[PDB]
Design an enzyme around this catalytic site. Structure first.
Site, PDB file in Angstrom:
ATOM      1  N   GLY A 137      -2.478  -1.071   6.038  1.00 48.06           N
ATOM      2  CA  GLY A 137      -2.448  -2.150   7.027  1.00 48.06           C
ATOM      3  C   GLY A 137      -3.568  -3.152   6.810  1.00 48.06           C
ATOM      4  O   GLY A 137      -3.831  -3.561   5.679  1.00 48.06           O
TER       5      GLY A 137
ATOM      6  N   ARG B  80      -4.359  -1.343  -4.805  1.00 45.07           N
ATOM      7  CA  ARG B  80      -4.052  -2.775  -4.711  1.00 45.07           C
ATOM      8  C   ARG B  80      -4.229  -3.316  -3.291  1.00 45.07           C
ATOM      9  O   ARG B  80      -3.724  -2.739  -2.329  1.00 45.07           O
ATOM     10  CB  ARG B  80      -2.623  -3.064  -5.187  1.00 45.07           C
ATOM     11  CG  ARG B  80      -2.225  -4.530  -5.064  1.00 45.07           C
ATOM     12  CD  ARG B  80      -0.816  -4.796  -5.567  1.00 45.07           C
ATOM     13  NE  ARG B  80      -0.730  -4.786  -7.027  1.00 45.07           N
ATOM     14  CZ  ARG B  80       0.377  -5.040  -7.723  1.00 45.07           C
ATOM     15  NH1 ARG B  80       1.518  -5.330  -7.104  1.00 45.07           N
ATOM     16  NH2 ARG B  80       0.346  -5.005  -9.052  1.00 45.07           N
TER      17      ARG B  80
ATOM     18  N   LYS C 169      -9.169   2.844  -0.995  1.00 47.23           N
ATOM     19  CA  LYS C 169      -8.472   3.072   0.277  1.00 47.23           C
ATOM     20  C   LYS C 169      -8.711   4.462   0.869  1.00 47.23           C
ATOM     21  O   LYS C 169      -8.273   4.738   1.985  1.00 47.23           O
ATOM     22  CB  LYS C 169      -6.970   2.846   0.101  1.00 47.23           C
ATOM     23  CG  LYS C 169      -6.626   1.485  -0.477  1.00 47.23           C
ATOM     24  CD  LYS C 169      -5.128   1.237  -0.479  1.00 47.23           C
ATOM     25  CE  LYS C 169      -4.778   0.017  -1.315  1.00 47.23           C
ATOM     26  NZ  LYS C 169      -3.338  -0.344  -1.200  1.00 47.23           N
TER      27      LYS C 169
ATOM     28  N   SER D 137       2.089  -2.507  -3.760  1.00 50.51           N
ATOM     29  CA  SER D 137       1.223  -1.468  -4.323  1.00 50.51           C
ATOM     30  C   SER D 137       1.097  -1.625  -5.834  1.00 50.51           C
ATOM     31  O   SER D 137       1.994  -2.163  -6.488  1.00 50.51           O
ATOM     32  CB  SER D 137       1.782  -0.080  -4.008  1.00 50.51           C
ATOM     33  OG  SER D 137       2.075   0.058  -2.630  1.00 50.51           O
TER      34      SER D 137
ATOM     35  N   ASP E 279       7.112  -0.641  -5.550  1.00 51.63           N
ATOM     36  CA  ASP E 279       6.693  -1.499  -4.433  1.00 51.63           C
ATOM     37  C   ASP E 279       5.724  -2.579  -4.916  1.00 51.63           C
ATOM     38  O   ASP E 279       4.690  -2.271  -5.514  1.00 51.63           O
ATOM     39  CB  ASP E 279       6.040  -0.663  -3.326  1.00 51.63           C
ATOM     40  CG  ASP E 279       5.448  -1.513  -2.211  1.00 51.63           C
ATOM     41  OD1 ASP E 279       6.066  -2.531  -1.831  1.00 51.63           O
ATOM     42  OD2 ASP E 279       4.358  -1.161  -1.711  1.00 51.63           O
TER      43      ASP E 279
ATOM     44  N   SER F 290       3.607   0.032   2.760  1.00 52.48           N
ATOM     45  CA  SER F 290       4.797  -0.678   2.276  1.00 52.48           C
ATOM     46  C   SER F 290       5.554   0.103   1.198  1.00 52.48           C
ATOM     47  O   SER F 290       6.767  -0.063   1.044  1.00 52.48           O
ATOM     48  CB  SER F 290       4.418  -2.065   1.745  1.00 52.48           C
ATOM     49  OG  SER F 290       3.483  -1.973   0.685  1.00 52.48           O
TER      50      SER F 290
ATOM     51  N   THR G  32       0.843  -1.170   0.000  1.00 48.92           N
ATOM     52  CA  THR G  32       0.000   0.000   0.000  1.00 48.92           C
ATOM     53  C   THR G  32       0.877   1.216   0.000  1.00 48.92           C
ATOM     54  O   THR G  32       1.845   1.296   0.699  1.00 48.92           O
ATOM     55  CB  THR G  32      -0.910  -0.020   1.214  1.00 48.92           C
ATOM     56  OG1 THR G  32      -1.911  -0.981   1.029  1.00 48.92           O
ATOM     57  CG2 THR G  32      -1.603   1.300   1.406  1.00 48.92           C
TER      58      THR G  32
ATOM     59  N   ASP H 278      -2.933   4.221  -3.700  1.00 47.57           N
ATOM     60  CA  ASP H 278      -3.017   3.202  -4.746  1.00 47.57           C
ATOM     61  C   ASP H 278      -4.267   2.357  -4.497  1.00 47.57           C
ATOM     62  O   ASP H 278      -4.975   2.576  -3.512  1.00 47.57           O
ATOM     63  CB  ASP H 278      -1.762   2.324  -4.778  1.00 47.57           C
ATOM     64  CG  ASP H 278      -1.765   1.252  -3.702  1.00 47.57           C
ATOM     65  OD1 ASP H 278      -1.860   1.601  -2.506  1.00 47.57           O
ATOM     66  OD2 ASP H 278      -1.673   0.057  -4.052  1.00 47.57           O
TER      67      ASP H 278
HETATM   68  B1  BO2 Z   1      -1.893  -2.140   1.863  1.00 45.74           B
HETATM   69  O1  BO2 Z   1      -0.981  -3.060   1.327  1.00 45.74           O
HETATM   70  O2  BO2 Z   1      -1.438  -1.829   3.147  1.00 45.74           O
HETATM   71  C1  BO2 Z   1      -3.303  -2.740   1.933  1.00 45.74           C
HETATM   72  C2  BO2 Z   1      -4.242  -1.639   2.356  1.00 45.74           C
HETATM   73  C3  BO2 Z   1      -5.544  -2.178   2.879  1.00 45.74           C
HETATM   74  C4  BO2 Z   1      -6.116  -1.196   3.853  1.00 45.74           C
HETATM   75  C5  BO2 Z   1      -6.517  -2.267   1.752  1.00 45.74           C
HETATM   76  N1  BO2 Z   1      -3.397  -3.862   2.870  1.00 45.74           N
HETATM   77  C6  BO2 Z   1      -3.675  -5.088   2.483  1.00 45.74           C
HETATM   78  O3  BO2 Z   1      -3.935  -5.380   1.350  1.00 45.74           O
HETATM   79  C7  BO2 Z   1      -3.749  -6.139   3.541  1.00 45.74           C
HETATM   80  C8  BO2 Z   1      -2.436  -6.810   3.719  1.00 45.74           C
HETATM   81  C9  BO2 Z   1      -2.547  -7.648   4.765  1.00 45.74           C
HETATM   82  C10 BO2 Z   1      -2.476  -9.001   4.581  1.00 45.74           C
HETATM   83  C11 BO2 Z   1      -2.593  -9.851   5.643  1.00 45.74           C
HETATM   84  C12 BO2 Z   1      -2.780  -9.346   6.905  1.00 45.74           C
HETATM   85  C13 BO2 Z   1      -2.854  -7.986   7.094  1.00 45.74           C
HETATM   86  C14 BO2 Z   1      -2.730  -7.140   6.014  1.00 45.74           C
HETATM   87  N2  BO2 Z   1      -4.680  -7.113   3.047  1.00 45.74           N
HETATM   88  C15 BO2 Z   1      -5.842  -7.262   3.591  1.00 45.74           C
HETATM   89  O4  BO2 Z   1      -6.200  -6.649   4.558  1.00 45.74           O
HETATM   90  C16 BO2 Z   1      -6.663  -8.172   3.004  1.00 45.74           C
HETATM   91  C17 BO2 Z   1      -6.174  -9.334   2.510  1.00 45.74           C
HETATM   92  N3  BO2 Z   1      -7.027 -10.210   1.939  1.00 45.74           N
HETATM   93  C18 BO2 Z   1      -8.350  -9.930   1.852  1.00 45.74           C
HETATM   94  C19 BO2 Z   1      -8.827  -8.769   2.361  1.00 45.74           C
HETATM   95  N4  BO2 Z   1      -7.946  -7.912   2.928  1.00 45.74           N
HETATM   96 MG    MG Z   2       2.385  -8.500 -11.265  1.00 46.34          MG
END
Ligand code: BO2
Ligand code: MG
Ligand code: BO2
Ligand code: BO2
Ligand code: CL
Ligand code: CL
Ligand code: MG
Ligand code: MG
Ligand code: MG
Ligand code: MG
Ligand code: MG
Ligand code: MG
Lengths: 195, 204, 217, 222, 233, 196, 226, 195, 196
Positions: free
Chosen positions: G47, G19, G33, G169, G166, G129, G1, G17
């Protein structure tokens, strides 16, 4: 405890449960009945951690007997199985979960059908033509998959059950000291005294 | 040990032209041991459909919970719950167990009765909403499903074409996962008719 | 994540030995391959089965073939199944503790011995026997074998029994499946009896046999 | 504590045609969440009409390829410039891998070329040297995303002929080099979308009786 | 197996039209203590190669001695030691890569991340990375440690792919490197203001710049920042 | 973190660096670690950013409520409220706080509260990871009853050295002057204090 | 992110972003986000996705009730205080890393907040990240007295640095601009530099390709009359 | 493996050894002979870790057979037992010790006496009238302590042995699939084919 | 341990405390940490007493054998022999050594060898647990080309502060002066250096 088996045939449900009770080093008993009658047409067998098995089975028994008196009516096997599942599903997130797996064999007097339910300690319920818990299924399911028919008689069900027990007695390392077999049908519950 | 992969199973959902599709396998197992080939993972409350992968006891519990809640909703609201509203209810319900969660991967699918707009959504085990336009995947073969969907899917497919796409996505994904398969079901959903088709597949 | 999961069997009978194996290889829940060759052709007269470590079985049973070839060049005589199985078991015993993973049936048919099977293990075990079954789906295959096995089986019926036993395991064991490979071992060498897809085989057996009534078809 | 292994990501794909063979691989190299290089060649021409890729831990991958190329050179010296056949190369690679059985090359190896009858050949290896000839094999990070798609579109799995309804399978008709490259490109484009370690570029090595040809295609750089 | 004691942080580098640039600060850290302030981490080999090293400084000094010994050894019985048979960047890198992978394979690594920057005989730019694991890769821009996370993104805006290299002049490339070093000083807690920079050009040769400082820093805006939320005074 | 508070003739001066780190990454290079809990009672914060912010906010609340009922609190009282929070929650907190204030009756006072939650009244105090490197310098150079200009130089030179040697310390040197005249904020940039 | 916040002349801009990832797999390619706490107070979240959503909705709900109770437009410092105290109480277990921005009667504001409950003030901020890639851009190109157009450009460029460099992201850039004396403009998919190319082949199957065992109509309607 | 028993009567030594071989989940064989003839009047039974048992037994067998050929003479049971003990005592401080327990039943032709030696994997040797390894002694020694006499016949020894096996089959949890019984006397070694 | 070596106009001076500790027990309060490896090449020892003694004894042997063959070794050479032992045996050693020597050609030189086995030539060096507390003081007060009397005062004041703050440092301050004139030993007692 160890091995509990179940098979639903045309007009009845048959439950087979091992007789052995082992306290680590020694076999303390070779005639233990691992089952409780919940209602006149519903039987539950059980296996899991020591103490929890009997404590859980008797707790369920008391609750179903209470329901029977209050309503002057016998709950359907499906209704009893759902109640038991909920109790186990409640238990798995408790401070100390019931470590108990059960089979519920019942004859539904309304639908005139035998019914067999398999429920593990997590509260995972499935209705099956035949079922088992632990390592019992690993040996027996291949025989049941081959020979089983929905239109089998009670006598044919017992013969297929004998073949399952014989395979267990051959390939299992533990001596489970044979099985107590019980039949659940329209007339109620009875024990096969020679097996 | 890992609660989300003890029982196994998968769910996939897709959008088409004036329609949605949701599909699932039928396996329930105890790790290596196959236990049931009739464990359906898709449920419906009115016209809103919910698929649930993960720990089977929680699958059953949550179905009973959302049946409970959508029935009370209907009595008070005097109307059936819509997919968008149900999605929020699933999210709220999962997040209340933030630090003791249900080990599941829910998938919502349906058509809004008033606007007629196709809708799908996916969640993680604690409530996060993934509201995709194209497709949603869940379960032990989610990686495989992502690969199938990402290549096979195209937008605005007709109901009978969408059936073929989602079926092939599920089947071939399941065949590359030990803990998935043992039969499959596909729901094709239109504004006022729903067809349910059981698929023939390899039983190993 | 090394590959894991299998069903392999071998049994002695009137007409020699039947060897039957599944074809699946899994890395965790991920199915890596459905086309794995779990019977090693050590030489035209000797077969070995693959269970545990794929590389360990492949490498050391090919090596065993080289040792068997050197033996018959030096002694001007076919190596016994007893001697061949022993060369392998003694080899893996040297490596005990290092982490080799092997559970195999060394199968052969010679003049002096007749049809012979030796179960050889990476912890040094070497057992002669009539029926062996190894893998994650071994218990399922044993059930079908034990209840239907006779010494006086025909080659046709014995081949089917081995095929049917792998199918039973492939159905119930998640980590077994793909296809069934059959072999018949005679005194004049082994004969390959084809690759059989489990998907097609299951429905075929269900209809013709009347088994698997629990499964809708 | 010192960890002698690492993960450089990447994904590779080998497909065997009727009279040809392709070995494809993405050009992205990574550690954790960082990109090391957008173009780091991963599939190599090893001589004798053989192409090779050892995907996973790049240090072990480079070491193995380097040692195999060396093996081809010494095979020529020791055996009167004899051509190393694909099956012989495969067996040789097994011994290279199993030689470090108790401290393995942390890689998924794939080689491609033509067999002695001129037909397309692909061989696949695990880290400790078990191998097998295959018609189709994806390796590395996004292997789980690609293989199910190949089962369906190369081997026509779960596909039946319309009208018969499950009774007659779709016939296994042979694919051309143009058709295979289309499936390779769509495999990597789909993998790129859903796998973070896949992207930047796609390099394909095509092997025929005429020799080894190269094709390059851009992939998404996010 | 060991742990790194006295350590050097980021090494950053990039290619430009006629050669390569490489840079690294002059600090030797002892954990959170910024112990040694006069450490040279760019080590030239001949007039065509510069080896930039990060990580353990004791291992860096060992590598420095190996490279010094390599030049001596190459000169033995070699009339063309200062001409056709001089050490190339590619030769020096491959040697180091061999040593790094061998040392990791004995479970006793040289705890370093190394970038070899130089220009070959035919004028081609050489830039390749190797570390304690023996992992190697090449790219138009390369950086170690924190530089990988902060410098690469900035340098990749100048040279995003191979085709951008001929379009990038030495002035633009040096500007980007110097800016990256400033950003690392803002944000890396184990960096210093003082650094060295080296340019290897195919026309003008090796230019080695010592005692450079980060300059043109923005700090004035700090005066307006008060408290952590609600505080006004 | 490099923080200090120094009593002098006219009152007390608080000093601090501006660096906040997540490992080796500087998450904030312009942090304000000099925090107001009352008009002329401030504190220097070291340790956990979350913990020390939470504590300071609670103390500000307590002293605001104290003022409404009993009038202006003493610096000793402010230190006691800090102590109560740091001592009773020692298991769950990572907070090293220096409390500094100016009364008219008591003049400039400094109280340091280390990890355990103990209180120590001192003529001057130093704390944070970077303070280790200036125990020698500060002990040799501190005098009682210094002038404002001398005290500013003492803090500037001290924190300059702490910043030079400590990786966790850096950025600008912030200072807050507490006297009868009022509250004055000072800032000193790298180009100024590095050449000292 | 990658999420960023940038102050400018007459307000503040935030960006992100799109993703979302579960391990090395992309769960959602076009994730949103940027969250609305109140009409003119928005925040970007990094997060744990459920946590950033949940904690924003809760504080956003309480902010609305507070605004109705006090007959005043909500302030950013109130959202900041409520968020940090909630996050501090849960000792970092609620994995929400937020960049909070907005305009209110006091003026324009920009804050960051971390999971353990610590807050920071700044003219430019980045979290997630890809925050190092983004902060590299911000530290290179940021200046005092930025215009609205310059701030949007800088914010989106910082997100792009995260998108390209990254692996956590990717995909698109979302932006929200909050200017003083104006409605906040939410620019969903402000940039779209990652459209997938046309596939080489169409994978539409012939009808009847899939084998079917049973068909049946599902009764979604209620119990009928007569 | 599991159960090995030994009893020295008037004019012979009797060894009884279980037939089961278990690979964790399944019983792979039910006719395994856990013994090796070291010399015409010396028999060794064994139990311990898989592989090591047979490898050790065969290694000892080879060494004693080598001695017999070299000297054209059979070593006394005492001499063989001391050799075996030394090998195990050597083994326990090796890189990877032999995890093997043995009983050595022999008839000394010089003294005209049966002799039974019990040796564990540490190299702990004892001469006994009756002996066992593992958990076998825990069940059987109380019966042997009661019934045993030094002047018992071979037939009486077998009857007492049957009583021991019956108690094991009753109270042990594991199914060891019966025992192979062998007798060692002046005429050599023979197997009791019906037991 | 608090140790340092300082180059000055006429040569170099080594300085050290005299405390050896087993945890909090002082096992030796009059330890000699200034050790001779050659006539005018000495070293300061910190870390393991066993390791640094073993190393110093080996170095003395090497330099004695060097002298018999090739004549007097340089200070750089002595440092290199120390480094070789510290670097190649880094896994098994805990030794922080400062090497100091006087040539006529090179004059006073100082080389510090920390834990890793790296070498650093410096105008002056500080090491040991107590050195942390005087990085600020030493950096501010060191000048090049000091006189003998100034250098003695610099070391005395520096180690005094290190001793004051470090529990592992204490006792007497030992010093060894290396010049063309010869080798002079100095000692300073608590009553003298504590009142500074
Ligand atoms: B970013 O990479 O920080 C992103 C922002 C989020 C607020 C949309 N985070 C994630 O994509 C997180 C990563 C993560 C993975 C595992 C534990 C904690 C955080 N992903 C998720 O929260 C996620 C993963 N799978 C399904 C739904 N959400
Ligand atoms: Mg790729
Ligand atoms: B200082 O280093 O003690 C500093 C003071 C704080 C009030 C800003 N602390 C930090 O930077 C801490 C880490 C730390 C470093 C050294 C000693 C103790 C603690 N950082 C954080 O608390 C932090 C970092 N990133 C985000 C949030 N909080
Ligand atoms: B000094 O504290 O480093 C000192 C120098 C030594 C050469 C005399 N070392 C010790 O006293 C060490 C322990 C130690 C303390 C502080 C830092 C590092 C090491 N002590 C011993 O080596 C020792 C103590 N008692 C008996 C034997 N050895
Ligand atoms: Cl703070
Ligand atoms: Cl000493
Ligand atoms: Mg169950
Ligand atoms: Mg499957
Ligand atoms: Mg299977
Ligand atoms: Mg299965
Ligand atoms: Mg805390
Ligand atoms: Mg600093």
């Amino acid at each position: 405890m160890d091995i509990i088996l179940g098979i639903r045939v045309q007009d009845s449900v048959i439950l087979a449960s091992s007789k052995a009770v082992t306290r680590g080093i020694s076999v303390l008993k070779d005639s233990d009945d691992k089952t409780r009658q919940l209602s006149p047409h519903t039987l539950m067998s059980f296996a899991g951690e020591a103490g929890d098995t009997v404590q859980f089975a008797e707790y369920i028994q008391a609750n179903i007997q209470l329901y029977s008196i209050r309503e002057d009516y016998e709950l359907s096997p499906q209704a009893v199985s759902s109640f038991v599942r909920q109790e186990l599903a409640k238990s798995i997130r408790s401070r100390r979960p019931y470590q108990v797996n059960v089979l519920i064999g019942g004859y539904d007097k309304k639908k005139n059908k035998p019914e067999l339910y398999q429920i593990d300690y997590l509260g995972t319920k499935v209705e099956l033509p035949y079922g088992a818990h632990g390592y019992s299924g690993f040996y027996t399911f291949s025989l049941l998959d081959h020979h089983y028919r929905p239109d089998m008689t009670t006598e044919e069900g017992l013969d297929l059950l004998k073949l399952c027990v014989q395979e267990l007695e051959k390939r299992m390392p533990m001596d489970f000291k044979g099985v107590i077999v019980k039949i659940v049908d329209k007339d109620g519950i009875r024990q096969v005294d020679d097996f | 040990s890992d609660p989300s992969s003890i029982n196994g199973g998968i769910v996939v959902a897709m959008t088409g032209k004036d329609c949605v599709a949701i599909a699932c396998d039928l396996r329930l197992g105890s790790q290596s041991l196959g236990v049931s080939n009739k464990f359906e993972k898709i449920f419906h409350y009115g016209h809103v459909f919910l698929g649930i992968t993960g720990l089977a006891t929680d699958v059953t519990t949550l179905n009973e919970m959302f049946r409970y809640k959508t029935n009370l909703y209907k009595l008070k609201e005097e109307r059936a719950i819509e997919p968008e509203t149900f999605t929020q209810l699933v999210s709220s319900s999962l997040y209340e167990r933030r630090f003791g969660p249900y080990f599941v991967g829910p998938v919502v699918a349906g058509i809004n009765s008033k606007s007629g707009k196709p809708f799908i959504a996916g969640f993680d085990l604690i409530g996060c909403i993934d509201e995709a336009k194209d497709f949603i995947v869940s379960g032990t073969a989610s990686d495989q499903l992502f690969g199938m969907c990402e290549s096979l899917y195209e937008p605005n497919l007709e109901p009978e074409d969408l059936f073929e796409t989602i079926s092939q996505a599920l089947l071939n994904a399941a065949d590359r996962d030990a803990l998935s398969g043992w039969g499959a079901v596909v729901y094709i959903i239109k504004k006022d008719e729903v067809v349910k088709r059981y698929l023939k597949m390899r039983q190993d | 994540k090394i590959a894991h999961g299998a069903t392999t069997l071998a049994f002695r009978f009137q007409g020699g030995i039947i060897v039957a194996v599944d074809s699946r290889a899994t890395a965790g829940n991920w199915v890596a391959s459905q086309t794995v060759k779990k019977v090693i052709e050590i030489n035209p007269f000797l077969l070995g089965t693959m269970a545990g470590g794929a590389a360990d079985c492949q490498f050391w049973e090919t090596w065993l073939g080289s040792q068997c070839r050197l033996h018959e060049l030096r002694e001007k005589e076919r190596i016994s199944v007893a001697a061949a199985s022993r060369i392998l078991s003694n080899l893996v015993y040297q490596y005990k503790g290092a982490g080799l993973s092997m559970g195999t049936m060394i199968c052969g048919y010679t003049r002096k011995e007749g049809p012979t099977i030796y179960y050889v293990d990476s912890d040094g075990t070497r057992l002669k026997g009539d029926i062996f079954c190894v893998g994650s789906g071994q218990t399922f295959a044993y059930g079908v074998l034990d209840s239907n096995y006779k010494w006086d089986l025909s080659v046709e019926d014995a081949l089917y029994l081995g095929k049917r036993s792998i199918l039973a395991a492939a159905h119930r064991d998640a980590y077994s499946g793909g296809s069934v490979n059959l072999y018949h071992v005679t005194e004049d060498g082994w004969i390959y009896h084809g690759n059989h897809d489990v998907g097609e085989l299951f429905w075929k057996v269900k209809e013709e046999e009347g088994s698997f009534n629990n499964v809708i078809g | 504590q010192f960890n002698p292994y690492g993960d450089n990501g990447g994904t590779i794909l080998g497909i065997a045609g009727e009279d040809f063979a392709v070995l494809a691989g993405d050009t992205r190299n990574i550690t954790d969440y960082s990109i090391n290089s957008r173009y780091e060649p991963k599939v190599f021409d090893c001589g004798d009409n053989i192409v090779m890729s050892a995907n996973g831990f790049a240090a072990d991958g480079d070491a193995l390829v380097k040692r195999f190329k060396n093996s081809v050179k010494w095979y020529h010296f020791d055996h009167n410039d004899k051509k190393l056949s694909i099956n012989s190369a495969a067996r040789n690679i097994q011994h290279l891998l199993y030689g470090k059985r108790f401290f393995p090359y942390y890689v998924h190896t794939i080689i491609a070329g033509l067999d002695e009858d001129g037909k397309g050949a692909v061989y696949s290896f695990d880290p400790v040297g078990s191998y097998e000839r295959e018609q189709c094999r994806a390796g590395g990070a996004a292997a789980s995303l690609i293989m199910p798609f190949l089962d369906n579109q190369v081997n026509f799995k779960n596909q039946y002929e319309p009208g018969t309804n499950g009774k007659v399978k779709k016939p296994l008709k042979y694919l051309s080099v143009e058709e295979v490259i289309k499936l390779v490109r769509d495999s990597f484009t789909s993998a790129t979308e859903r796998h973070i370690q896949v992207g930047d570029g796609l390099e394909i090595l095509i092997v025929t009786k005429d020799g080894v040809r190269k094709e390059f295609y851009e992939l998404k750089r996010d | 197996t060991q742990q790194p004691i006295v350590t050097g942080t980021s090494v950053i580098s990039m290619k430009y039209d006629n050669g390569v640039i490489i840079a690294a600060d002059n600090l030797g850290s002892y954990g959170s203590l910024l112990r040694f302030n006069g450490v040279e981490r760019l080590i030239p080999v001949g007039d065509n190669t510069v080896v930039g090293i990060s990580g353990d400084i004791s291992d860096m000094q060992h590598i420095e001695r190996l490279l010094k010994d390599l030049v001596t050894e190459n000169a033995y019985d070699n009339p063309l030691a200062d001409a056709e048979e001089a050490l190339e960047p590619s030769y020096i890198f491959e040697y180091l890569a061999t040593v790094m992978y061998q040392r990791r394979s004995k479970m006793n690594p040289l705890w370093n991340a190394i970038i070899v920057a130089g220009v070959q005989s035919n004028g081609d730019q050489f830039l390749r990375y190797v570390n304690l694991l023996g992992v190697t890769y090449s790219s138009p821009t390369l950086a170690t440690g924190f530089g990988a996370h902060m410098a690469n993104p900035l340098l990749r805006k100048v040279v995003d792919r191979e085709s951008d290299i001929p379009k990038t002049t030495v002035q633009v490339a040096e500007e980007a490197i110097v800016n990256a070093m400033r950003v690392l000083y803002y944000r890396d807690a184990r960096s210093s203001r003082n650094f060295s920079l080296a340019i290897i050009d195919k026309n003008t040769g090796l230019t080695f710049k010592k005692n450079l400082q980060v300059e043109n820093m923005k700090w004035d805006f700090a005066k307006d920042i008060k408290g952590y939320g609600t505080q006004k005074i | 973190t490099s923080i200090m508070a120094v009593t002098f003739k006219d009152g007390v001066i608080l000093g601090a660096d501006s660096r906040t780190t997540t490992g080796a990454y500087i998450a904030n290079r312009v942090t304000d670690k000099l925090t107001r809990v009352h008009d002329k009672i401030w504190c220097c914060r070291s340790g956990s950013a979350a913990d020390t912010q939470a504590i300071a906010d609670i103390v500000q609340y307590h002293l605001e409520l104290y003022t409404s009922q009993y009038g202006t609190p003493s610096t000793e009282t402010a230190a006691s409220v800090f102590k109560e929070l740091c001592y009773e929650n020692k298991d769950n907190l990572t907070a090293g706080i220096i409390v500094a204030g100016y009364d008219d009756k008591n003049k400039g006072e400094v109280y340091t509260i280390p990890l355990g939650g103990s209180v120590h009244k001192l003529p001057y105090a130093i704390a944070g990871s970077g303070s280790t490197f200036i125990y020698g310098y500060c002990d040799k150079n501190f005098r009682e009853n210094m002038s404002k200009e001398e005290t500013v130089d003492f803090i500037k030179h001290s924190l300059s050295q702490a910043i030079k040697w400590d990786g966790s310390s850096g950025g600008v040197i912030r200072m807050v002057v507490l006297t009868a005249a009022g509250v004055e904020r000072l800032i000193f940039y790298p180009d100024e204090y590095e050449q000292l | 992110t990658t999420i960023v916040g940038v102050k400018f002349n007459n307000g503040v801009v935030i960006a992100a972003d799109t993703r979302s990832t579960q391990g090395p797999i992309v769960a959602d390619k076009n994730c949103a986000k940027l969250h609305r706490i109140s009409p003119k107070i928005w925040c970007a979240g990094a997060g744990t996705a459920a946590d950033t959503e949940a904690v924003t909705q809760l504080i956003g709900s309480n902010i609305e009730l507070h605004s109705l109770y006090t007959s005043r437009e909500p302030r950013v410092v109130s959202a900041l205080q409520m968020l940090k105290q909630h996050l501090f109480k849960y000792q970092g277990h609620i994995g929400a890393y937020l960049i909070v921005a907005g305009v209110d009667p006091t003026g324009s504001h920009l804050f960051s907040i971390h999971a353990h409950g610590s807050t920071d003030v700044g003219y430019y901020l980045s979290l997630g990240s890809g925050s190092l890639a983004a902060m590299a851009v911000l530290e290179s190109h940021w200046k005092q007295d930025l215009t609205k157009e310059e701030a949007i450009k800088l914010a989106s460029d910082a997100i792009q640095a995260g998108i390209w460099n990254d692996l956590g992201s990717g995909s698109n850039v979302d932006v929200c601009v909050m200017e003083i004396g104006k409605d906040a403009e939410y620019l969903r998919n402000y940039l779209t530099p990652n459209v997938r190319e046309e596939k080489q082949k169409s994978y539409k199957f012939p009808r009847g390709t899939t084998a079917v065992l049973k068909e049946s109509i599902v009764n979604i309607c209620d119990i009928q009359e007569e």
